[PDB]
Amino acid sequence: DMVGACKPLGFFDPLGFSKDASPASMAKFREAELKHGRVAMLACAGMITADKFHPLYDGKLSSNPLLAIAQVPKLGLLQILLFIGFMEVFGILNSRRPDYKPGDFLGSSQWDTTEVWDNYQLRELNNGRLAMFASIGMLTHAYITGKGPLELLD
Amino acid sequence: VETMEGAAGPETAGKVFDPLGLASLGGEETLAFFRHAELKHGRVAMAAIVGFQFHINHVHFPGYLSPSAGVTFEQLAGVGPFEAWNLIPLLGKMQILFTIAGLEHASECLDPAGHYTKGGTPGNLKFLKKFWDTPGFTDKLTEEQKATKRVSELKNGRLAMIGMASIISAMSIPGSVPLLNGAPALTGTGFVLPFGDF
């Protein structure tokens, strides 16, 4: 079926969803899951590194994640949005392709993959889940205390 | 405009009531678009009537709207209905506008049958599942009750547009509406700009 099932929880699906949903709906769910995990991993790494190492912008932007983005200039935000939009139109074209594999920009249906490929895909998925929880935790902590992750840990 | 629901009414002498004949500007597509626009206007006017009543009466959520900027529902509830929108922080107004934007985009896109002008029913939004009737209160009824209930939706929507246009002018054209002139509550600007000043 898919790769997400793991030892600690098994096939975690209390509330249905998987059944009574179209294959297109399942592909959309897995694409959204992988996108969330990847973006959350990027956010976690960015917050962790930018807490204690932010050389850009003359080192003046705050370590608070929720205020550093406010202090970033408008042109930088526009360029980041343009880059993300370009990545997303590539994702849309990949969706329109007839051999789409939710989340697989690499292809990977055209190579002799084995169980190690599924294991590594599960590694990506579980790290993405952990980052999904962690990034929202980081943002909530920044809103509450005003400190970033590592500053809070101090 | 003869198959549409609002065609027959006791007050309109059972007539389609198109004096300017605007139904003939195009095919069935433009009339479907006009009906969808009418339904959306009536719905937003209904919500506007409820919010305006809740504002001119003392009914507000308790707490701080924007703890960072010190803007509070109490401050919004004592500057008249419309200057409250100006008093909302810009980024909060942008998060309301963006959510309405995404909802509108979903309405235009996600209909399985197709566009309301090209196969969908005008005013149908339930392809966004549980967007409407989240409680699901309407599940009990059948189609025949829903027909009369949609007729009442159209009529009440027209009346709500009339009411909100009343309150929006009485602000702007002094004493626009007799009996809506005292303004014990109707104060300030009548039509706000989006994002305050832009």
């Binding site: 590539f90 074209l93 990949n94 697989d104 920009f105 690499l106 055209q110 190579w111 | -």
Partner: protein, 143 residues
């Protein structure tokens, strides 16, 4: 779990079907670039390539030119971009003359008429892109 296989199931062609060469991202980006996009006429291909290159060609001359610390820095940069574009389209024309000597097909980049249309589009697009970049850099205070 092999990830590098023969190119088009041909072990004896001098290529490999690596993730870089053959992945869906590479295929999408390359096939959707103007030079490979489907349905675009040679004029449209040349036009898109022209504006894309002429927009960025001004910047090096403007910032790092001899007259960077001069009031006419941007004008000199635009003239330098125009000269480089003139050289580029001269190169394109002589390349077409040398390669597509005899041809009567047209509507194809590998034909004389198609390459001439592509070069014309490139010239117009590059001049327009350099001019637009000049306007943007003059009105940089907007951003």
């Amino acid at each position: 779990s092999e990830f590098v296989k023969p190119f088009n199931n041909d072990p004896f062609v001098g290529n490999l079907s690596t993730p870089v060469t053959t992945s869906t991202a590479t295929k999408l980006y390359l096939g959707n670039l103007p030079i490979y996009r489907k349905g675009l006429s040679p004029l449209m291909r040349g036009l898109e390539v022209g504006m894309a290159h002429g927009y960025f060609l001004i910047g090096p001359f403007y910032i790092l030119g001899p007259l960077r610390n001069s009031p006419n820095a941007l004008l000199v940069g635009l003239f330098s971009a125009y000269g480089l574009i003139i050289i580029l389209t001269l190169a394109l024309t002589i390349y077409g003359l040398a390669s597509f000597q005899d041809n009567s097909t047209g509507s194809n980049l590998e034909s004389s008429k198609g390459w001439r249309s592509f070069t014309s589009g490139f010239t117009v697009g590059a001049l327009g892109g350099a001019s637009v970049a000049y306007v943007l850099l003059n009105n940089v205070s907007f951003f």
